[PDB]
Structures are given as C-alpha cells and as structure tokens.
Amino acid sequence: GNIRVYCRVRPPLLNEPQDMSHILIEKFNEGAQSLTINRNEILSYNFQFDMIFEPSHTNKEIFEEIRQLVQSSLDGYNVCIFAYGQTGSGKTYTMLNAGDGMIPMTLSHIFKWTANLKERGWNYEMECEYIEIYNETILDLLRKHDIRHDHEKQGTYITNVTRMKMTSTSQVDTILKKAERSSRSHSVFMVHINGRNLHTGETSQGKLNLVDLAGSERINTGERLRETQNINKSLSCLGDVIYALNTPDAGKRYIPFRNSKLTYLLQYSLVGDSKTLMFVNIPPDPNHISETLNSLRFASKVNS
Numbered sequence: 001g002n003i004r005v006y007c008r009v010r011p012p013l014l015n016e017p018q019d020m021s022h023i024l025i026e027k028f029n030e031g032a033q034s035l036t037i038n039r040n041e042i043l044s045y046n047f048q049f050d051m052i053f054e055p056s057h058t059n060k061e062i063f064e065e066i067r068q069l070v071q072s073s074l075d076g077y078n079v080c081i082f083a084y085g086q087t088g089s090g091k092t093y094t095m096l097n098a099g100d101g102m103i104p105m106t107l108s109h110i111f112k113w114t115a116n117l118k119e120r121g122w123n124y125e126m127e128c129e130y131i132e133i134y135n136e137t138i139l140d141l142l143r144k145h146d147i148r149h150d151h152e153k154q155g156t157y158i159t160n161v162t163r164m165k166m167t168s169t170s171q172v173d174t175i176l177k178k179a180e181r182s183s184r185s186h187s188v189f190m191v192h193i194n195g196r197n198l199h200t201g202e203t204s205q206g207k208l209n210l211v212d213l214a215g216s217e218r219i220n221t222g223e224r225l226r227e228t229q230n231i232n233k234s235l236s237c238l239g240d241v242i243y244a245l246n247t248p249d250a251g252k253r254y255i256p257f258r259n260s261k262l263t264y265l266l267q268y269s270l271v272g273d274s275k276t277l278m279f280v281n282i283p284p285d286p287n288h289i290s291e292t293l294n295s296l297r298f299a300s301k302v303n304s
C-alpha cells in the first residue's frame with residue numbers, strides 16, 4: 001500500500017541551546033527532500049524523506065499536507081498516521097496540540113466534509129475508540145481486552161473497549177480533553193467511518209488510526225529494563241512490518257503483525273488499499289544528536 005515519511009524538526013524551546021547549524025534542510029527537489037546532520041569531532045549523515053518540515057512550519061501548515069490523506073478515509077480507505085521519535089521531540093505536540101493537532105484538525109475537517117457530503121445524499125455515521133498500549137497490554141482511555149480479527153470481512157475490534165458515537169466537533173473535543181507513562185506507551189485514536197448514499201445505495205467504509213508512539217530512546221531496576229524491552233521491540237516490530245509491506249514482493253512475504261499489540265490491532269489498516277504516513281519528530285538540540293540519528297535511521301529504513 002501507500003507509505004509516506006515526513007520528518008519534522010521542532011524549534012528550540014526557550015531554555016534549550018538555540019543553534020541549529022548542525023542541521024541542513026535542502027529545499028524540496030523535483031523526487032524527495034533531503035536533510036543532512038553534521039557532527040564535529042566532522043561526520044556527515046544524509047537522509048531522504050517525502051517531506052521535511054522546518055522549525056518554522058506550523059501545525060496548520062503541516063495539516064494541509066495530510067488533509068487529502070485523512071479525507072480519503074471517507075472514500076473507503078483505512079489510514080494510519082504515526083508520530084515517531086525520542087521523548088521531547090514533538091510527537092504529542094504534533095498529534096494532540098489543542099485545536100492545532102493532527103487529531104483535532106482531522107476531526108474538524110472530517111465533520112465539515114461529512115456535513116458537506118449531505119448535499120450529495122451521503123449519510124456518515126462515526127465512532128471513536130481511544131486506547132493506549134503500555135507493556136504490550138491494552139488500556140481503554142474512554143472507559144481485559146483482546147483483539148478480534150475477521151479475515152473474511154477484513155475488520156477488527158477490541159473486546160470491552162468503549163466505542164463512542166461522534167456527534168459534533170465540539171463533543172469530540174471534550175472526549176480528548178477529558179482523556180511519564182505516556183512517554184512510555186503508544187496512544188491510538190481510532191475513527192470508524194461508515195456511510196451510505198441515500199440516492200445511490202452506495203456504501204463506504206473507512207478508518208482513521210492516529211498514533212502517538214512511545215518514545216524511541218534506548219536506555220542504559222529490571223521492571224524498567226523489561227518495560228524498555230517491550231517498547232524497543234514494539235517499535236522494531238512496527239518498523240519491520242511497514243518495511244515488509246512496502247517491498248515490491250510483499251504479497252510473498254511473512255508480515256509479523258502478531259509480534260506486537262499495535263501491529264496486530266492495526267493489521268487491516270496497514271494492508272490492501274491502505275494509506276500510511278509516518279512523522280519522524282526530531283529535536284534541534286545537538287546534545288541529542290545520537291538519538292536524533294537513530295530516529296532518522298529508523299524512519300529512512302521504513303521509507304526505503
């Protein structure tokens with residue numbers, strides 16, 4: 001299916017080092033955008049992405065870049081957007097920032113398009129789930145949960161997880177607001193979209209899966225050592241799955257969906273017609289350069 005990788009370099013916070021000269025972002029070159037990281041010991045690293053957002057690029061500017069993507073979920077597509085990176089790099093800000101976030105923007109633009117489509121005779125019914133995966137166990141944020149797949153109807157649900165009907169842009173916003181560990185867990189906001197055209201009888205089923213990933217950094221008590229092993233293996237698994245789905249021979253490959261809760265849960269949104277987008281968030285601070293490079297490698301591997 002379709003996979004795209006955007007890199008976002010966030011701007012320095014007030015108390016952080018302010019110098020970005022170690023990061024060089026080329027203008028978009030007609031077919032990838034490149035960035036290079038220089039570390040002075042002088043080592044150069046280069047990476048290619050579908051798009052690179054600079055410290056000056058706003059949430060609203062970025063959403064214009066994913067708008068067609070998330071809109072395609074009313075067109076019968078399953079869509080996954082992931083935000084990946086080191087703790088502090090801007091994952092949650094990108095996805096959740098109030099009124100600005102990919103999640104708030106997508107929800108708004110969804111209701112607008114939905115309302116819009118009544119003119120064509122379309123009636124859409126929407127539900128959301130919001131869950132978090134911590135140590136490969138599932139927590140329902142809208143409150144035992146198991147993942148149940150129907151291979152014939154290509155669909156998925158989690159047992160005993162509240163699924164709330166979505167009414168207004170206002171009403172949806174309250175659910176989010178209402179709902180360190182979070183730095184260590186994956187948070188997954190899902191929007192189930194079913195529609196039918198009153199005049200035509202035409203049916204539409206689509207999905208949005210918006211994911212704020214556990215932080216990717218690698219550690220150096222044993223409850224923490226285990227936790228950090230789950231996280232690292234969960235992230236690797238996600239990377240292996242996306243990479244394998246991208247190969248030209250993918251239909252001939254084993255895809256290890258079953259190796260983590262996130263990939264198992266999302267399997268039918270990762271496959272077939274599905275569209276996937278991954279943000280790599282990176283901090284500007286040269287003090288974090290090695291974690292930054294790990295992040296960049298992870299995402300480029302997936303991209304390739």
Ligand SMILES: Nc1ncnc2c1ncn2[C@@H]1O[C@H](COP(=O)(O)OP(=O)(O)O)[C@@H](O)[C@H]1O
Nearest residue numbers: 010011085086087088089090091092093094183
């Ligand atoms: N693009 C951005 N513009 C302004 N502030 C940002 C941006 N990205 C992150 N921040 C801020 O930097 C800090 C870390 O971001 P956060 O979203 O918590 O990181 P993560 O989710 O990757 O752990 C927060 O204080 C957040 O408000």
Ligand SMILES: [Mg+2]
Nearest residue numbers: 091092182183
């Ligand atoms: Mg966070």
